[PDB]
Amino acid sequence: NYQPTPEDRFTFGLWTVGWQGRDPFGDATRRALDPVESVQRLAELGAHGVTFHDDDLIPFGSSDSEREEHVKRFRQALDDTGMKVPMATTNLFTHPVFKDGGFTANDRDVRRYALRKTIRNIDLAVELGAETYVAWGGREGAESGGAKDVRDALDRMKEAFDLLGEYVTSQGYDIRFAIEPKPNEPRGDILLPTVGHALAFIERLERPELYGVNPEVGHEQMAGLNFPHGIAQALWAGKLFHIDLNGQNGIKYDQDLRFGAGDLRAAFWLVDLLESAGYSGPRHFDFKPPRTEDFDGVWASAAGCMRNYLILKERAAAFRADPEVQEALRASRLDELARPTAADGLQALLDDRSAFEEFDVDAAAARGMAFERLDQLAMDHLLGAR
Amino acid sequence: NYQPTPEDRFTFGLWTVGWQGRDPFGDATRRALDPVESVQRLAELGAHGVTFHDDDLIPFGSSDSEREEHVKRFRQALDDTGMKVPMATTNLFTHPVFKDGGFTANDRDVRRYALRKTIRNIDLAVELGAETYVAWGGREGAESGGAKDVRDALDRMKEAFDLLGEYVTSQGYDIRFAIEPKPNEPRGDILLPTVGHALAFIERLERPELYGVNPEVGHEQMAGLNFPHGIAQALWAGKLFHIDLNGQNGIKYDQDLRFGAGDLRAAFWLVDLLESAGYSGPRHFDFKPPRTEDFDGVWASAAGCMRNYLILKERAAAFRADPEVQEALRASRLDELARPTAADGLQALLDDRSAFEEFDVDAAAARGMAFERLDQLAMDHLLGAR
Amino acid sequence: NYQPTPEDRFTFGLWTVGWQGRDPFGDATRRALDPVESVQRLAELGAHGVTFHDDDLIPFGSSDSEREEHVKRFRQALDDTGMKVPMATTNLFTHPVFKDGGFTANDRDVRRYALRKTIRNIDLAVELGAETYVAWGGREGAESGGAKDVRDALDRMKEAFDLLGEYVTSQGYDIRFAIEPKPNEPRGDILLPTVGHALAFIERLERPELYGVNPEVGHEQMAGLNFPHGIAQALWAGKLFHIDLNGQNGIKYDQDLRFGAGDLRAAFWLVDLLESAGYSGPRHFDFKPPRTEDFDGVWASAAGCMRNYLILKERAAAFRADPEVQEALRASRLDELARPTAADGLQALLDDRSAFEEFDVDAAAARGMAFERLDQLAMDHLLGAR
Amino acid sequence: NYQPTPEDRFTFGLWTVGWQGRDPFGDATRRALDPVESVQRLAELGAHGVTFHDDDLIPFGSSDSEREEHVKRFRQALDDTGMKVPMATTNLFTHPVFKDGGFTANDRDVRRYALRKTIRNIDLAVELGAETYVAWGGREGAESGGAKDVRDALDRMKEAFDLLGEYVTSQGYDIRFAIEPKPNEPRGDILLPTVGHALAFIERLERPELYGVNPEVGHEQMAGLNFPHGIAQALWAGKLFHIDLNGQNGIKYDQDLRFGAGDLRAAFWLVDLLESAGYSGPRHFDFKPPRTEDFDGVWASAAGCMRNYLILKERAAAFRADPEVQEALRASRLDELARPTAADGLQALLDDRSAFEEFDVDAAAARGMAFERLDQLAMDHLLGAR
Ligand SMILES: [Ca+2]
Ligand SMILES: [Ca+2]
Ligand SMILES: [Ca+2]
Ligand SMILES: [Ca+2]
Ligand SMILES: [Mn+2]
Ligand SMILES: [Mn+2]
Ligand SMILES: [Mn+2]
Ligand SMILES: [Mn+2]
Ligand SMILES: [Mn+2]
Ligand SMILES: [Mn+2]
Ligand SMILES: [Mn+2]
Ligand SMILES: [Mn+2]
């Protein structure tokens, strides 16, 4: 049951199943994976494609011949499996040069390098067919207040993204950017810490249409925020270009659990929203198989990502299609929420005694919203307890 | 020492010093205050002005004669003291009619009422000289996923704010709006939960220039965010129209402690930023004297708000003016953060071998940022330990 | 399906379904309920019993004749329905006299009053058949550091609980105490903030056997803790005398959602643990129907508490009984976790070369734990997706 | 000013100043330090001593000759400087063998190994003069519910600590154990997650007098708890055997900032408590110089730890000695908090009409606590603004 196929558009980063298990208190628990092997194993599980940071595919410091060979082998794996590469990104966080940032490093020479590194990989992303180029500015931020003037850093961040937009447009590329928020970790505070901050920033870029967000479940939950609500605001803005799916337990370090783990009900409401909104992008998993696992456990955890999406998709669809739930949604006035407040216009509102002098506030206040009955229908559907 | 005067522009809501101490587990511990008495007592402490929700000044349900009389008495107090009213707002949260929201209530008739209530108070705010009209949508949101379609609610929220902008423009008023984020409480999740989400939303209003944010220290800290960073992003966007100053200890219920309490170092960095940026708006306190206090303690806590601002202003100024700190800022490359990354242009960057093929990554990585020395200078200045 | 009956031992506080919906930003949205009516309505839903604070049953300030009459009517309702009263407690938080605490108020006369108030209600609890007397010290704590010397407050708290133990023993009562932790709200920080702190404190009481804990799902989750783990530690200590069941979304104000709402997977693991451990106490709900609801919604939300417990009980049982899961538990070495590390004794361990000089660390490190496969079996069982 | 000397008892782990800066998203930014060099540099800053994990001093896997040589060199550095070694600990977290735990690993052979590893290092700790042996069970816990039966794991944890107590007693050693709580990271949830849970656990060990806690500032703050309050409870229990000092900003990953950074007011109240209680143990820093720093910044950050302690010690002493503050403490009834509630005894309390029938609740409720004035005196003292 709940068997994924490539038509489900499930994608995985190389760095997900390839995570060796190092952590700040721990050494690797797994050997490195060849990207060719992860392409093959993901395909066999029913994935649609893979994504990469530059340095996941090509070791940092490679010669041009080494680079060609890594890319050749990867392309052969993609061709052998039918896997796609819908998204790529830059690693602007691992190398010590990026310890104060890439695009917002205090050192100008590092900012210029970060841009050159990114632009080299945009070209490769396009080679490989990617439609989206993600940017997670994990090193952009500070541990102390004097270290980083945030106005100046936002000026630098805008320059960087505007240069990248100039570049793609100069080359005639179709690729679009997706900025990935995170509130903290590895920096004490990261710039553009939530979906909202990233959306706001994009509106000040010179070509805003080229940029959207890549929200990650666990990242918004590291700020205690409602991930489905943030996704709804990104969809409302027309900016959900890509998404990272995983699990998180609240406010703590970035756990990157498999999707469905962590906050299960938020996963249900997320799937419900993506499906009802007709989101057409990749269902991408940015997760890490726990370091307790061997390779068999890596593949089990990846399979579980997809399985849980498909279970939740079935249950959300059944919820929305249930006449009893449709009834309950009307009883809770979700239909009224979707109608304009004052399509009659401002003057008409001002002249409507039913809106003020003759509004019976107590009668309106007495009306229950019937939200608990609706929510228990939702729970019953999620649990298969109807 | 650190004596405030009206020229410091310190303001207080009527509902701050007037908070009777009810909480969800507790009855009032203080009698209600007459607004006239709080105007007088605040003036005597050196405040510049006061702010109000409609229902703080005029009891809900008042007749026109009662309303005139409440306003008359308040105006006399303002005239007796020289206090100003720079901001007002609407109470769209206390009355049970607003239990599912004002502007985004599922019930359309409630949304229309909320707008009429607001517009009546805009007129009064303008009467009294207010430059800013705040909106805190504390009831906008949900406890469960099916109860609120956030796309539809954002459509309703945009209609509401666009109608308010149509109204002010129709009347020729100069007043501008400031949306106050909060992530949760009283709703399980509140819409526009952070500065970023509110900034993003404003960009989609029909007349965005009429709207900014009213960030509150404790609200961003309820999401674990860096309040000075969020203020910097609001300043970068040109949208810091007003601010609420108070204290909070992290991620928990909204504490509304006096300013300086809660996160003291964040208070220092906030003041440093407001002063270095030349923020010219009110320094408004949205706080609650703890319910342990009698009226003497109310006034002590209000005085402490202002005192702590003035202490932190002195220390931040001394930090920035210290030649030793100026030196340390250059050593940490804060000067370089403020210069353009690539004013030479994209092509020039692309053709600069110093940015890639001949960039010595290891040499750059070895350079320490010197942030800890800078931060300990900051600590020494804050503590008066230089 | 999932129909509760009194044999399931589900209990509710009067203050749960009777919550009028006041909050710190909001007035009541529901009328007060007569305890007689809530007894009747709960019984009809299949509840086993009810619990009370003194002031829920007898208005504060009642005369002896009024008190007798309130108790008479309540007893008639209990007799009419077959409902039980397994637990009672004291309200040491609503009245302004308790603004700095009951048992740890700085004012000694308040501490003495708090004790007298409690002892009066212990007598009534015993009258009504209660086996457990809960104490939630919601006002014990501080908003500022100088206000409360915690060593001195713990001395006062120990005196108070030791006096209560002297009292029950003097009267020959069988009732036992259960201390309910909470980390914050209404105080900035509450004393005994978690299960662990309360367990530790109990060990220093003069008659520790008389005292256990009453952990509440949402309270431990307000500190970001794992509620099932804390329950396991209370069970390990022999101290789970009572429990409060509800839902919470992480680190924020105390939400008191219906059980099953909030962290659904934690609810599953909680039920699994209570049932596998053979917890024999009440399954008590300390929840609040959201203030959006009318009375119909109150009863729906109460019914949902019980329904969700029963669904999760079925799924947890099925998980543990599945041979495939039993296999997976052995593959993950849960059997080995349950065997003694060194029943051979210290000397034997010291002389065992297999434990050190000849332990093959790499071979052991290579063994995967198989936890992800186990967890996806758990997920499949919870969702009814096997 | 604020110059530390060895008599201040400041200590540092080798792993603090020696942290190379690896993090889960980042490679090392600093070379490894020779322990000899850190001993020398710490001594020159005015430190009293150093602490170590086994694997900080002796590379994992060393031969007996290599081990002797590492220890010889370290002892020479200690002798050259007069530095002490008051505490040591075991690394039961870095090596992949410990991926599911040391003492509570599911694999029994790993649990036995963990014990042998610890016991070898206890012997060395004693060699070097240590009085305290810390245990931080960072790998004890789980990412999923089925992986770890917490009752069984606590049985294993108790066996392990009881075996260690048998060992020290068999050898006639004076050393005592200190269990270090942490709520999460690297495991999704860690067992014994707070001071309270560890204190409770200790009471169930066979020789409880041999065990205390080693609380860390940032760890309790990762659960949003009040660190000074938790320290007060550990002192009340007689169990503050050691402490880890650092800084943290709330609920997020373990930051390990220098002491004084993070929550500054909590640092002030902590110092106030340690000094007023006469804590006589090491003032140990478990911190990490941020990876932005070079070696000069490492030493600056270490110096700042000590400086901030000494500043806060001066300010706390001045607060407590100020007659004005002494007055304010009496006005807030801190004197009354320290007197017994009912030294007259239970019967006397029961017969005291002033405690109930003739207690004037309203008069008592009207009395303000004067906490805000007290707290602003505290703020003025901290800031040097008296
Ligand atoms: Ca889950
Ligand atoms: Ca403070
Ligand atoms: Ca749930
Ligand atoms: Ca600080
Ligand atoms: Mn992540
Ligand atoms: Mn991601
Ligand atoms: Mn607030
Ligand atoms: Mn506010
Ligand atoms: Mn609760
Ligand atoms: Mn409770
Ligand atoms: Mn730490
Ligand atoms: Mn530590």
Side-chain angles (χ1 to χ4, degrees), chain A residues 2 22 56 167 170 176 179 209 301 318 334 375:
Chain A
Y2 307 108
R22 297 184 294 279
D56 300 332
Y167 182 73
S170 78
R176 305 180 303 180
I179 295 174
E209 67 278 2
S301 194
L334 276 300
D375 195 56

Coordinates of all heavy atoms in Angstrom, one line a residue, chain A residues 2 22 56 167 170 176 179 209 301 318 334 375:
Chain A
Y2 N 0.4 2.4 -0.5 CA 1.1 3.7 -0.3 C 2.5 3.6 -1.0 O 3.5 4.1 -0.4 CB 1.1 4.1 1.2 CG -0.1 4.2 1.8 CD1 -0.5 3.2 2.7 CD2 -1.1 5.1 1.5 CE1 -1.7 3.2 3.4 CE2 -2.3 5.1 2.2 CZ -2.6 4.1 3.1 OH -3.8 4.1 3.8
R22 N 27.9 12.8 11.3 CA 28.7 13.7 12.2 C 27.7 14.7 12.8 O 27.0 15.4 12.0 CB 29.8 14.3 11.4 CG 30.9 13.5 10.8 CD 32.0 14.3 10.2 NE 31.5 15.1 9.0 CZ 31.4 14.7 7.8 NH1 31.7 13.4 7.6 NH2 31.0 15.5 6.7
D56 N 28.5 18.5 -2.7 CA 28.0 17.2 -2.6 C 28.4 16.4 -3.9 O 28.5 15.1 -3.8 CB 26.5 17.1 -2.4 CG 25.9 17.8 -1.2 OD1 26.6 17.9 -0.2 OD2 24.8 18.2 -1.4
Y167 N 22.7 37.9 -13.5 CA 23.5 36.8 -14.2 C 22.5 35.9 -14.9 O 22.7 35.6 -16.1 CB 24.3 36.0 -13.2 CG 25.1 34.9 -13.9 CD1 26.2 35.3 -14.7 CD2 24.8 33.6 -13.8 CE1 26.8 34.3 -15.5 CE2 25.4 32.6 -14.5 CZ 26.4 33.0 -15.3 OH 27.1 32.0 -16.1
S170 N 21.1 37.6 -18.0 CA 22.2 37.8 -19.0 C 22.3 36.5 -19.8 O 22.7 36.6 -21.0 CB 23.5 38.2 -18.4 OG 24.3 37.2 -17.7
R176 N 14.8 29.9 -11.5 CA 14.4 30.8 -10.5 C 15.0 30.5 -9.1 O 15.4 29.4 -8.9 CB 12.9 30.9 -10.4 CG 12.1 31.2 -11.6 CD 10.6 31.2 -11.3 NE 10.0 30.1 -10.7 CZ 8.7 29.9 -10.4 NH1 8.0 31.0 -10.7 NH2 8.3 28.9 -9.9
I179 N 14.8 31.2 -1.6 CA 15.5 31.5 -0.4 C 14.9 30.7 0.7 O 13.7 30.7 0.9 CB 15.4 33.1 -0.1 CG1 16.1 33.9 -1.2 CG2 15.9 33.3 1.3 CD1 15.9 35.3 -1.1
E209 N 10.2 39.0 -9.2 CA 9.6 37.8 -9.9 C 10.5 36.6 -10.0 O 10.0 35.5 -10.1 CB 9.0 38.3 -11.2 CG 10.1 38.6 -12.3 CD 10.7 39.9 -12.2 OE1 10.4 40.8 -11.4 OE2 11.4 40.1 -13.2
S301 N 14.3 4.9 6.2 CA 13.9 6.2 6.6 C 13.5 7.0 5.4 O 12.4 7.8 5.4 CB 15.0 6.9 7.4 OG 14.7 8.0 8.1
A318 N -9.8 12.4 1.8 CA -11.0 11.8 2.4 C -11.7 12.8 3.3 O -13.0 12.9 3.3 CB -10.7 10.5 3.1
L334 N -16.7 28.4 7.3 CA -15.5 28.5 6.4 C -16.0 29.0 5.0 O -15.2 29.7 4.3 CB -14.8 27.2 6.2 CG -13.8 26.8 7.3 CD1 -12.7 27.8 7.4 CD2 -14.5 26.6 8.7
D375 N -12.7 19.6 14.1 CA -11.4 19.1 14.3 C -11.4 17.7 14.7 O -10.4 17.0 14.4 CB -10.6 19.9 15.4 CG -9.2 19.6 15.4 OD1 -8.5 19.7 14.3 OD2 -8.7 19.2 16.5

